[PDB]
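Re: guanosine-5'-diphosphate structure - here you go.
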Amino acid sequence: REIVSCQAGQCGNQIGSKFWEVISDEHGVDPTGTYQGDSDLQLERINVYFDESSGGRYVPRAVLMDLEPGTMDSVRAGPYGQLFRPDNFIFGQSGAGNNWAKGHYTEGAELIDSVLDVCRKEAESCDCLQGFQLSHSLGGGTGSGMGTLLISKLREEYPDRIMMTFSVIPSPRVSDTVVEPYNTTLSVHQLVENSDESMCIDNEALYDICFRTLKLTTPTFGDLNHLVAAVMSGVTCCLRFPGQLNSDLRKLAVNLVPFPRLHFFMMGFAPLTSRGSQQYRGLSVAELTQQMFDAKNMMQAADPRHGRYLTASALFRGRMSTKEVDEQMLNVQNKNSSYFIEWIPNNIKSSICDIPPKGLKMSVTFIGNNTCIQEMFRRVGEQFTGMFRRKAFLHWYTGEGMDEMEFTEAESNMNDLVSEYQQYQDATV
Amino acid sequence: MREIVSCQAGQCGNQIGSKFWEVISDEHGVDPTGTYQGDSDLQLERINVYFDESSGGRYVPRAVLMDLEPGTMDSVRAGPYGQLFRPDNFIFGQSGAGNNWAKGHYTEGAELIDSVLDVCRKEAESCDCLQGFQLSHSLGGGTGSGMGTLLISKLREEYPDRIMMTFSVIPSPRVSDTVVEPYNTTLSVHQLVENSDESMCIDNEALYDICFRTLKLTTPTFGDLNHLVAAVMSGVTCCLRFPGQLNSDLRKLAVNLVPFPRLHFFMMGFAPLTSRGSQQYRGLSVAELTQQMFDAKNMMQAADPRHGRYLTASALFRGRMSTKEVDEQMLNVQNKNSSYFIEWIPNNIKSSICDIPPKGLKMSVTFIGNNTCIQEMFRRVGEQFTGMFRRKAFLHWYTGEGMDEMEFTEAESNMNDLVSEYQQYQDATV
Amino acid sequence: ALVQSNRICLSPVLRDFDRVRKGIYEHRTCTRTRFARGLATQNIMLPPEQLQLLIRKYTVPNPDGSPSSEVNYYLFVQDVDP
Amino acid sequence: RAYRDRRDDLYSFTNPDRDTVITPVQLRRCIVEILTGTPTAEEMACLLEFFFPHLPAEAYTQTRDNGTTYAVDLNEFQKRYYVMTKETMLPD
Amino acid sequence: DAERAAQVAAILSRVRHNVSVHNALLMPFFADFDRHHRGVITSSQFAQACVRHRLPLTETEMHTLASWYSGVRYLSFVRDVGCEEESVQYA
Amino acid sequence: VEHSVRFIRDGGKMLRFYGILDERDSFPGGMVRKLEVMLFVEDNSMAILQRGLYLSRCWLPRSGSVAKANELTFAHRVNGQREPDMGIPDAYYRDVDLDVGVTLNVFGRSVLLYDCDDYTREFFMERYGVSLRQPID
Amino acid sequence: MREAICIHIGQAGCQVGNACWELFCLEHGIQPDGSMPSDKCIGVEDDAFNTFFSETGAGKHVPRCLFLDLEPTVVDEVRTGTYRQLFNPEQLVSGKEDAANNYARGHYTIGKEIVDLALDRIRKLADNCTGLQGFMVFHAVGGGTGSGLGALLLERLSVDYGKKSKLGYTVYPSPQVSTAVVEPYNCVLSTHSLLEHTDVATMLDNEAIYDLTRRSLDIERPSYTNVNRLIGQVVSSLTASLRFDGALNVDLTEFQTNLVPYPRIHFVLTSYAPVVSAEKAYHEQLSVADITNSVFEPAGMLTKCDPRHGKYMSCCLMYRGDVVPKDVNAAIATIKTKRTIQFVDWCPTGFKCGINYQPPTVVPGGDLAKVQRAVCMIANSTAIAEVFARIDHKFDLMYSKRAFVHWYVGEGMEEGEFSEAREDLAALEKDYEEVGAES
Ligand SMILES: Nc1nc2c(ncn2[C@@H]2O[C@H](COP(=O)(O)OP(=O)(O)OP(=O)(O)O)[C@@H](O)[C@H]2O)c(=O)[nH]1
Ligand SMILES: Nc1nc2c(ncn2[C@@H]2O[C@H](COP(=O)(O)OP(=O)(O)O)[C@@H](O)[C@H]2O)c(=O)[nH]1
Ligand SMILES: Nc1nc2c(ncn2[C@@H]2O[C@H](COP(=O)(O)OP(=O)(O)O)[C@@H](O)[C@H]2O)c(=O)[nH]1
Ligand SMILES: [Mg+2]
Ligand SMILES: [Mg+2]
């Protein structure tokens, strides 16, 4: 029933802060944790993401992780930053240094005992813990290293619990470091082994959505985090609110993970339109489906046209009829069968939740397994082998308690995952 | 249900479409606010032909704006009814069209036709029953001609069975305000011939003559010109949008006006059209309607109907009028001037009655004619094109964006064949 | 109200009924049967009581003072359609 | 010779008189805009008193000169430069 | 009209300084506009002549000068602005 | 005649007003728009600038509907008047109409004028001798 | 959007640009300080200044201009004059010593040490422009800087920016009045640059403007001030189509395509009307037909070249102000019926028209009067062969006996450059005759 959230790195911490922005907005929770909602449905499942105190204050089931205390300080200085527990701010004195070696092996592992302690405390507090959620970036030091280490430890401790991750992977148009190849390569195999479902986010696609769709001039990290938090909150709408066809967090996993290695998804939100263009866009299931399956609306920088959809899930929120939410999926499958895997007709789950997002009448979140997710892994592998062939930047990793062959192992794991995606894309009946 | 998706290519097409939506929202009782204020249920009965409903109950036109320059986009948006159009239908590029068919059809238009077709496909899918694509453009321009031809070309394969109206403004020597009329018109007509199931030619010189002698106006701007075009552009869909004693639509018109596939070029006319001083004096009747309808000074072409013979014609009569009377007046005009018509295609004229007249008009009629004298305009354009092409002038521009002389020769041959078909059917005998 | 809703023009049909069969160009009066003729040709279905009331109000009196079988349709047209 | 104002004045635009003197407004605009200096009120008051000894204290912040009633020519400017150099020199 | 007189005097002083600096003759430029040698040119004539001479004057000041010398008495204007060959002190 | 008399005396000069157009309650996603409602006095015609041209060169009807100028009978254009007739006299807003604190019916929407520039104030004082109201928030 | 970068080479180019910018500032309402007062509003279409003026954070408007000269007198005069706060300190490049009225000096010795930072400034201006439409370079081929440095800069711009629009407003030597004796050499040598690396060349010689002002402006003794003001009025009339909205809108490439029939043939003569006397009151408002007839009349022409000796190939007319398309078309029809002017056989239409609703603006104390309507002509005609014939006959006369050639030789240019320049000019005259010849 309960989802416990963990937030690693600067990217993960800010994204989680905006996630709790959205969740408190939806559930009518003040910065001081006092309930102010106008409906009983908020209190009826407030416990999923919140825990009540003696005084009635609702504290998030959130844990914060960073080897740099600056992001923790910024979070506490934020508007809803006072909502979190004080002990969940587990921080290191020395920064992560943008190094997976000392974010995962020496400095990350030294501090990870306390984060396992608080995660255990949250798990004990939960009546029937539905699962774990993580938010981080695969290109950073502590978001990648400590995030993967937490994923591994929590997988070892709770084998039968769903474990979402939200990984902000980089793009050529966004690269603001030189070690994305190394960090991403060292993190992808850990995510493959130890995560039930991994949800990919790319700042390039976020910026493309913010300009081409939202018609913004200066879209900031706040707007990007709001966009990702919309999908994060739309994942668990069926858990937190009733609907004619709800879904737990394991519904999506079981209907979108045909094979253990294939659990990498691409995100998508609808309706998404500029403030001035809301006047004409008629809110309907057909328009929702169109913007859902539009390639540019995908907030992960890949083209679904180049690949074939393994599976899909559309979590609709609002008062809409089931006839259209079924017929639109049938229509898109029939008239774009070339974009879906042939040996699995009816690739799309459709879940219905009664409560729509605040300020909207109907909305939907898209969770999609498509083989075009292999293009980004391929480019990251090319970058990784280009840097690794000449031992570039490798001394930072090797001197901090690492070995040479594990890099080859991680590269081989990425290549195996890419090969599996390609051989399921080109497979024929 | 049955509906038309409109496209506006070039600044000419954009302003014509802006005035067309002026008129259409006037008929359907839609203020710039987009809501409905009409006094009749008949306006809402078939308002989905040109409009789509929004979440708030407002109505948005099914218009796609197309120009490589953003200036006409801004002007149309700033227009009185510019608030109706969807901003995502405003497809424009940074670099101007350069007044070049090659620029508008091969290099600058190719990179924007993807977005244009995306918008058109979205509109078509959203529509319950696609019926027609209407385009408004000028063949004498750069992006009105090249990009419009490209758009209709790529739309033809996507929707082969749906009607294709083009409202092409072909320039005239008296209104020739460019030097590449021959090149652009020649490179556009061969596309239109096989990519438009009904083309409708608008001639500025003749609309100006209408404003000068039929209306007696001294200094008119482009406003009443676009109003004149929009009059017929709206009266074509009269039976589509409103009931009548003899209903029709685009395909009824096309089936009754296109005897052979390559003869689908039409000339337009509107009646009545009187000056204010003589407005109260003249008695509006179907007799005056037909008399002005079959008169050259009311036609919208600088082509002389005496030198041609009407293969087919269509009068969309709007208003409450008697069917026997309209039909017998068409019979009377045929009998009075049988030489002006064609013997081997009897019953040349298409009378279609619409119950609802234009607002403020007791009765009206729109005339669509497949007369032969379009061969005169085709011949003059071909003569100018040959004069330019022999001396090679202004051709390095077109060859710059990848075109070759073979395309120009093929376009000239296509225009020659098109004019020769009309020449054959003018003197063809039973 | 029906007239500005449906763009109703009873003037030509009423004029034709005034001048039909008759060498008189215009008399500005017409029979009740021909008034109902014009309304029906314009497709305005009305109750018989309403039609009788309208023709009684717009009828022209005979010189002796008794009501006649003719309706002053010109005043009706002027009052209804401006 | 003058600061920006709603008036469309060549005096505030440039020095139309084309005369070889420095007015208080000219010196203030020179220090602020072309010398990339940002002195405070007291610093600029001291500078203006050093350059124009007879300028009234209320005219330090004035937005327009009174023609050329308070100005320093080339010789006076060179003398002030030599004084500022003396402040660098050793005592004499 | 004390304010107008003071403004006119200041404008004339500025033009006098500019003309003394430039040592430029204004009579041919101003008298080309006087076709009939009547000593009167209109406000546009005076404006174009002063713009020719590039005198440091704006439109409002220049119209004020034309009104003060009102047609414009360009001869008296040149006398007032003064020159080595053409000044009030010359006579 | 009168046209170029106005071009010489009133030609090219311009009256700015600052206005607020409130659309929040009208439709979802409505935004308050800061506009400049600006009147050419030679033609006596208004344009609106969104602070971005909200409204182009046009005469803005008092009723807020240009339907009678769009009338398909070409009675809207007069030979000697560039201004459309609209079929009724004094049908378009004028400078005497424009004032601070006035809600203009711009084509069916209410734009409230809250401020004017000193040039507009001076023009009104010089020609009509009316003191425009002080600006409002 | 629709940005156009102005370049000003040499003293003539600098002064012409000064007039152009003093016109543009008052046309767009921007004061010489660089700001738009909120008290009064001059223009209705905001972003109209974006073509010529770039917005700043503080709210000012910096011109997209490069005043490049090898000598510092005119650039210092600009730095001192009323437009110092308008113009950026950079893009105001002044050298240490002039090109000495020598094409070789300005193109080979002194121009090579200045073209690098000239191009740096051009790049810094262009990267700001996200929708740049073209370059407009003002210079005089008669002088040394405008010839040599102009050629070098045009070559570098052509090789750097590809096929972007390039309008060279050049003050060609006049048939009889002249300033220098090396002017024919400079004109002939600059022809290489004005042919291969100039999309449209606009002749603006001085005798035509002097004759226009002596007659239609009632000014007995005009000057370079009037010359530059008329040139700036022509430039503003050309650019008003893209700056302001109008019935017929044209752009750089829009008129360049309709104006240049062949790559070599891109020299266009210009004429402007109504150049009515602001000295003259009581002036009747001229009609469109009247102004069109005056423009077609060689009296009101900005180039000293009589079109009756040649034939028009493509005429582009910009009608600014309250202009009716039927006034325009009646004027065009009357012009075509008129027989004193002839067109070429292969260009029947030959008429390009652009109507803009903005009337011309008047500078303070300007010879031009406030008019409702005006029309500017850009005419490509075969009659322009005569000015080339005059200039190269003068070149041959002065070159047959090695006069004034040791300066060019010693300033780092080969003797064969003169011969190939003469051959190229002869080829230009020959192909003008060929295109004017009947088919
Ligand atoms: N239109 C116009 N032309 C000018 C102006 N000043 C000079 N010229 C032209 O410049 C030509 C003489 O060339 P130069 O005196 O050498 O000036 P330049 O072309 O800039 O060459 P440099 O002096 O080396 O910089 C004359 O024939 C004039 O046509 C002016 O103010 N306006
Ligand atoms: N969407 C989003 N991305 C962010 C935000 N902050 C940082 N990032 C991304 O995170 C990446 C850097 O991660 P980093 O902070 O170094 O991770 P860490 O070293 O583990 O803390 C950059 O490429 C950013 O694109 C944010 O607030 N929102
Ligand atoms: N009827 C009418 N014709 C127009 C209008 N605007 C332009 N034209 C005609 O279009 C022709 C030039 O087209 P052009 O502007 O170059 O088309 P574009 O390059 O595609 O924008 C001219 O001959 C005009 O007569 C208009 O508003 N109404
Ligand atoms: Mg039917
Ligand atoms: Mg020089």
